[PDB]
Structure formats: structure tokens, C-alpha cells
Swiss-Prot record, chains A, B, C, D:
Subunit note: Oligomer of 24 subunits. The functional molecule is roughly spherical and contains a central cavity into which the polymeric mineral iron core is deposited.
Species of the source: Aquarana catesbeiana
Listed GO CC annotations: cytoplasm
Catalytic activity: 4 Fe(2+) + O2 + 4 H(+) = 4 Fe(3+) + 2 H2O
GO biological process, one term: iron ion transport
Listed EC numbers: 1.16.3.1
Name the record gives this protein: Ferritin, middle subunit
Binding positions for Fe cation 1 per the UniProt entry: 23, 58, 61
Domain Ferritin-like diiron: from-to ranges: 6-155
Purpose of the protein: Stores iron in a soluble, non-toxic, readily available form. Important for iron homeostasis. Has ferroxidase activity. Iron is taken up in the ferrous form and deposited as ferric hydroxides after oxidation.
Lineage: Eukaryota, Metazoa, Chordata, Craniata, Vertebrata
């Protein structure tokens, strides 16, 4: 084994690799949403830039797992990054609903990894997840939920003026 | 009696304690409104922060009565702070209507205390109410009335776009 | 359930509401201590301001639980804030002893909530308590214990000069 | 009558002259206390300077009544300023007790003048007293009461160390 390895279970090492892949998958889905809202026949540029920023965040999340793996003496093993589930995202409401589900999927994987780390008595991995992932996850889920509530209030999907107003007032001006 | 006490009637001392409690009650009601508008299924954050700020203002009002009591040689006597009348506040219009009524209730108590102070020939207490409470009360009542007029103009409760616009333009961006 | 809710047990939601109430109760007790030490026949103004500051801290603690509740998709439910156990607090030693007991009561409730969160496998709630509450609690308990030791050294309750000196040197000049 | 005179009763004019004299009397008493604490066999210089400052404040109070009289078209009429009741003031506790009584005597005269102004339906004079005199009076009475409580706590009159400590910590370093 690696000269640095201590209290790091093979199962946790493998699960970290799977989590890395999921972060990259999430990044790619957000990239797709960016490209969709940038289309000339969609043209909601603040929404597009919101998703582009989140795509970058998720890739940073992935890189943090790579660094973590090496710090513990595990070995990064990469797999294909699967393309997103859709090629087009409907409108801001449909995209935000998909984002909420994606964030909850990522959250569940993080919680499952915490359970595994707990089972294998790995407090360093528990701390890493709690300090770097779990709270930012709850914050993102809350933000997207708040957005969905406002999109519904604004009459999405039917109310185009509502969708226009959301892009101008609810997401940061880019 | 207290060595500082002069021209301070027992009835006024007691009424100041009751007014202190009412300020704390008002604070707590505004706290509840803050928490409601912060819910993910309500998500009107500028409205939420408006009510949070008012909750802090009312607690400051209460503390000013505590200080006043001691300055005159009266004794602060606290009672339970009753929970607010509602657990959920409907929407921005319903909440603002409740706020208007609350501010008028507080105003009536201040006016009643002024009547008592006048009856007991206590010009210091009259001045305190006039200089620190009565005008700020009229200003807050006017502000909330103006808000209600605009919420009705915007089609509340039915018009969700109107409610969204109020939160963006009528209350301070937080 | 709330669209944001994930891995949040009803028992934990309820316990967070109870903890919120306890924070408000603690705030109110400290408010009472402030008013007592501000009396003309007590007149220990640095001690008074110490308790006023702690009253504000506890209310901030309460507000942080409200925000937490909403972030997780729980619902804030408020109850009456009970008045403090005493109307007068004796002297600086008696008040500090009551403060120590209060801080230990709050600490026990936080520890009990951590046990519940652990039982329900909620690492986000565990992290929240550990990162935002448990250490600041230990620090406050240590500070108050240190104060009590010094008040006893200074000859409280009998030694009025000792009590005067504590207010001038041990608590921050306000 | 004076070309400016309007709604100013002769009784109020006379009472303003009497109040002016009382302010000058209070100033002179505080001057005497200053000189006493400046004695080489008393030598409490921060206490001395406290009383000197208050002597100046009272003379400013007197001058404000002179200005007021002329603003309303009344005529300033001066009488002898009687010497203080004592030639020596015992110690810090005795002096502060005399100061408390003096401030309450001045306060009673201000309250009596407010009653007269009310009886003669003079809202300008009522406002003047409320805005310029009554609250600063309550503040000074509270401050002196707080001092007396602390002097007693410090073991005055017998405890010379207590008296020394009061001069160093309770009154401003001059
Ligand atoms: Cl290992
Ligand atoms: Cl181990
Ligand atoms: Cl692997
Ligand atoms: Cl496959
Ligand atoms: Cl999808
Ligand atoms: Cl598709
Ligand atoms: Cl998903
Ligand atoms: Cl985090
Ligand atoms: Cl939003
Ligand atoms: Cl609509
Ligand atoms: Cl705008
Ligand atoms: Cl009285
Ligand atoms: Cl009177
Ligand atoms: Cl009462
Ligand atoms: Cl009741
Ligand atoms: Cl109501
Ligand atoms: Cl309700
Ligand atoms: Cl009401
Ligand atoms: Cl006002
Ligand atoms: Cl408005
Ligand atoms: Cl409408
Ligand atoms: Cl859940
Ligand atoms: Cl789970
Ligand atoms: Cl509950
Ligand atoms: Cl009960
Ligand atoms: Cl107690
Ligand atoms: Cl009691
Ligand atoms: Cl307790
Ligand atoms: Cl902490
Ligand atoms: Cl200490
Ligand atoms: Cl001792
Ligand atoms: Cl006239
Ligand atoms: Cl007239
Ligand atoms: Cl005259
Ligand atoms: Cl004579
Ligand atoms: Cl005398
Ligand atoms: Cl004499
Ligand atoms: Cl006198
Ligand atoms: Cl004043
Ligand atoms: Cl003092
Ligand atoms: Cl003594
Ligand atoms: Fe992520
Ligand atoms: Fe994410
Ligand atoms: Fe108020
Ligand atoms: Fe108010
Ligand atoms: Fe706009
Ligand atoms: Fe607390
Ligand atoms: Fe505390
Ligand atoms: Fe004066
Ligand atoms: Fe004076
Ligand atoms: Mg090797
Ligand atoms: Mg392996
Ligand atoms: Mg495929
Ligand atoms: Mg842990
Ligand atoms: Mg953290
Ligand atoms: Mg994030
Ligand atoms: Mg995320
Ligand atoms: Mg995340
Ligand atoms: Mg937000
Ligand atoms: Mg007494
Ligand atoms: Mg009474
Ligand atoms: Mg009830
Ligand atoms: Mg005013
Ligand atoms: Mg106001
Ligand atoms: Mg108000
Ligand atoms: Mg008010
Ligand atoms: Mg306005
Ligand atoms: Mg729903
Ligand atoms: Mg439940
Ligand atoms: Mg009870
Ligand atoms: Mg920490
Ligand atoms: Mg603390
Ligand atoms: Mg604490
Ligand atoms: Mg604490
Ligand atoms: Mg320390
Ligand atoms: Mg003429
Ligand atoms: Mg005349
Ligand atoms: Mg004579
Ligand atoms: Mg004033
Ligand atoms: Mg003054
Ligand atoms: Mg004065
Ligand atoms: Mg005065
Ligand atoms: Mg003071």
C-alpha cells in the first residue's frame, strides 16, 4: 500500500472515485443547461450564466475529491462521464426542477458516503464531507427550491413575461 | 421607594411594564413573519428581511422602556411573551394587513399610556412617548398602509407576478 | 413534504423548534439580568452590559435555528417565551451562578439534540451543532466559571468593594 | 408690553426669573463642593472636577433661562445668589447625597413651572422645559443615585480605600 495510507478502507477509496464521477456528471449536465439557455430561440442569458457557474463549481468539487484521494493514499480511477439525460431543457422551470433533482441525487450520494465512512470508522472522511460538501449542498438545494417557488408564482411554464422577469431579477446580472 | 423616584405614579410604572411586554410581543410576531417568508415554499426574501428588521426594532423599543423604568426608579417586571396569533401568514398582503393592525394596537397602547401620564401630571413620561414613540409609530403605520395599497394595485392575493414585483421593487433589496 | 426536504426526521424538526424556544428563554433571562444591574440601587453597569450583550447573542442563536429549520424544509413553530425564574438577581455572584446553570442547561439540550441527530443519522445537523453551537457553549461556560471563581476570591457576596472591583476590571468597560 | 410678547403670562415670566436664580444657586453649591474636594486635606481631584463641571452646567442652565425670557418678551430680574447651605461637605458620600437632594429640588421647581405653564396654556414654555430641562434632570438624578449606591457598596463613610477607589474609577479621570 501507499506509504501515507492510514485508516483508509478500500470501500471508501472506491466510493470516492464513484463520487468524483458523479460530480463530473453533474458538471456536464449544468454545461448542457448553459448551452440551452444561450440558444437564440431561448435567450435567457442570466439563467444560462447561472448554470455555467454551477458547471464550474461541480468540476471544482470533482477536483477536490481527486486531491482528497491522493492525500489519503488512494488511487484516482476515472470512468466515462455520461452525457446528460436530456438534449434540451424545456424552459427555466423544467431546468430548475431537473437541477433540484440532480442536487438531491448528489446529496444522497454524499450522505451514503458519510454512512460508509462512519461504518468504517473514518472520522477524517466524515469531517471532509461535513466541512466541504454537506452544508454547501443544503444551501444549493434551498436556493433552487426558492427559485422553483418563484417560477411557479410567476406563472411558468405558460407566462413568458414571468419567465423574462425571473431572468432579470432572480439570478445575478451577468 | 427608590432614591431617584420623583413624580412617578405606581400606575404609570405598571403601564410601562405592560407596554414593554407588548413591544416584545410585537417583536415576536415580526420574527414569525420573517421565518414564514424565508420558507422555501414562500421565498420572498426582501419581504422576510423587512419583517426581521422590524422584529429587531420592536425589541429595541422594549429595551428602551426597561431603561426608562430604571431611570425613573420603577422596577422592571417581566411576563411571558405570548406566541403570535398565527403560525403561517398566508401571503404578503395578509401579513402586511396583520402588521398594520399590530402597529395600530401598539399605537393605541402608547396613546393610552400618554393619557395616563397626562392624568398623573407626568410631563417627563409624556415627552418620552412623544419624542421616542408616537411619531415613529405614525411613520410605520403610513409606510405599511402605502404597501397595502400597492399590494392591492398589484392584484394580491391572486396575482403572483404582482407579489413577486412588490418584493423586488417596494421593499429594500437585502 | 417540502421540495427541499432530504434526510430530515420529524423528531429532529420538532427538537429544533424546542431548542429555538430555549434560546429565546435564555435571551429573556439575560435581559432580566441586564435590567436588574441597571437599577439605581444595584448600579453595576459593566455587569449589566455584559448580560445585555449575552441576551442579544442568545436571540441570534434562536434566529440561526429558524434559518436552519427552513434550510432543511422543516417548519418553524413558536411557543410562548416563559418569563425568567426570578424577578431580581441578588448580586453579581448569584447572577453569574444562575448564568452558569442556564448555559449548562442550554448545553445539555444541544448535546441531547446531537444524540437525536446521531440516532437519526443526520450528519448535517450534527455538523451544524458542532460547528455553530457546541464550542461557543464550552467557551461561555468556562468564562462564567472563571468569573465565579474570581467573585468568590473577591469576597462575594459580603465584600462590596470586591463586587465593585469585579465590575471595573473583569468585564469589558462599556 | 414688549412688541414680541404673545401668550406669555406675567406669572410665568416671574417663575422663569425664580428658576434662573435657583440654577445660579445650584451652580454656586457645586462650586463650593469643587473647592472642598480640592483642599489638601480632602484631595479627591476627580470628584472635585466632577463638581466643577456641574457648576458650569448649572450656570449654562441659568443663561438659557435669561435667553428664553428675552425671546418671549419678558424681563430678566435678578436677585442675590444665596451662599450654599454648608461650608464643608464631609466626604464624597455626604456631598453626593446633598447633590441628589439639590437635583431633586431643581427638578421639583421645573415640574412646578411646567404645571404653571400648563395652567396658563403656554405650550412653548412646556416644550422648552420638556426639550431642554426635564430629561437631562432625570439623567443627572439617576447618575448621582448610581454613585451613592456605589459609595455605600465601597463602605463610605468609614472605608477610605473605598472612597479612593471611587475617585479613580467611577468619575472621569481629569
Ligand atoms: Cl489503511
Ligand atoms: Cl484507526
Ligand atoms: Cl474505483
Ligand atoms: Cl454504461
Ligand atoms: Cl432530466
Ligand atoms: Cl431531450
Ligand atoms: Cl438526478
Ligand atoms: Cl459544506
Ligand atoms: Cl428566488
Ligand atoms: Cl400567470
Ligand atoms: Cl430594476
Ligand atoms: Cl414618586
Ligand atoms: Cl410634581
Ligand atoms: Cl407590573
Ligand atoms: Cl394568559
Ligand atoms: Cl393575525
Ligand atoms: Cl395559523
Ligand atoms: Cl393586533
Ligand atoms: Cl418618535
Ligand atoms: Cl409602498
Ligand atoms: Cl391583477
Ligand atoms: Cl426527509
Ligand atoms: Cl440518508
Ligand atoms: Cl414543534
Ligand atoms: Cl406551561
Ligand atoms: Cl434562577
Ligand atoms: Cl425573584
Ligand atoms: Cl437553568
Ligand atoms: Cl461553536
Ligand atoms: Cl474572570
Ligand atoms: Cl473578603
Ligand atoms: Cl402676552
Ligand atoms: Cl393663545
Ligand atoms: Cl420677577
Ligand atoms: Cl433673604
Ligand atoms: Cl446641605
Ligand atoms: Cl458647614
Ligand atoms: Cl436641596
Ligand atoms: Cl432635557
Ligand atoms: Cl456609578
Ligand atoms: Cl467596608
Ligand atoms: Fe457537487
Ligand atoms: Fe451541485
Ligand atoms: Fe414598537
Ligand atoms: Fe412597531
Ligand atoms: Fe423591473
Ligand atoms: Fe444560546
Ligand atoms: Fe448562552
Ligand atoms: Fe440646572
Ligand atoms: Fe443640576
Ligand atoms: Mg512505496
Ligand atoms: Mg481497493
Ligand atoms: Mg449512453
Ligand atoms: Mg461526527
Ligand atoms: Mg461548515
Ligand atoms: Mg454550492
Ligand atoms: Mg451542489
Ligand atoms: Mg454540491
Ligand atoms: Mg436566498
Ligand atoms: Mg434606598
Ligand atoms: Mg406599584
Ligand atoms: Mg397560549
Ligand atoms: Mg420627534
Ligand atoms: Mg419605526
Ligand atoms: Mg412601530
Ligand atoms: Mg413603533
Ligand atoms: Mg414612503
Ligand atoms: Mg410543494
Ligand atoms: Mg413532524
Ligand atoms: Mg408562568
Ligand atoms: Mg469550530
Ligand atoms: Mg458564545
Ligand atoms: Mg452560550
Ligand atoms: Mg451558546
Ligand atoms: Mg478568559
Ligand atoms: Mg415698544
Ligand atoms: Mg409681571
Ligand atoms: Mg444668609
Ligand atoms: Mg428630549
Ligand atoms: Mg445634565
Ligand atoms: Mg441637573
Ligand atoms: Mg439640570
Ligand atoms: Mg450610568
Amino acid at each position: 500500500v501507499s506509504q501515507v495510507r492510514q485508516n483508509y478502507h478500500s470501500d471508501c477509496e472506491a466510493a470516492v472515485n464513484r463520487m468524483l464521477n458523479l460530480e463530473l456528471y453533474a458538471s456536464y449536465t449544468y454545461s448542457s443547461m448553459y448551452a440551452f439557455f444561450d440558444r437564440d430561440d431561448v435567450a435567457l442569458h442570466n439563467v444560462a450564466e447561472f448554470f455555467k457557474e454551477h458547471s464550474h463549481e461541480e468540476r471544482e468539487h470533482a477536483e477536490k475529491f481527486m486531491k482528497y484521494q491522493n492525500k489519503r493514499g488512494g488511487r484516482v480511477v476515472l470512468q466515462d462521464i455520461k452525457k446528460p439525460e436530456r438534449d434540451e431543457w424545456g424552459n427555466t422551470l423544467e431546468a430548475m426542477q431537473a437541477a433540484l433533482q440532480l442536487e438531491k441525487t448528489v446529496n444522497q450520494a454524499l450522505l451514503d458516503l458519510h454512512k460508509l465512512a462512519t461504518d468504517k470508522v473514518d472520522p477524517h472522511l466524515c469531517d471532509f464531507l461535513e466541512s466541504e460538501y454537506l452544508e454547501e449542498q443544503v444551501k444549493d438545494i434551498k436556493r433552487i427550491g426558492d427559485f422553483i417557488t418563484n417560477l411557479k408564482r410567476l406563472g411558468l411554464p405558460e407566462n413568458g413575461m414571468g419567465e423574462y422577469l425571473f431572468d432579470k431579477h432572480s439570478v445575478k446580472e451577468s
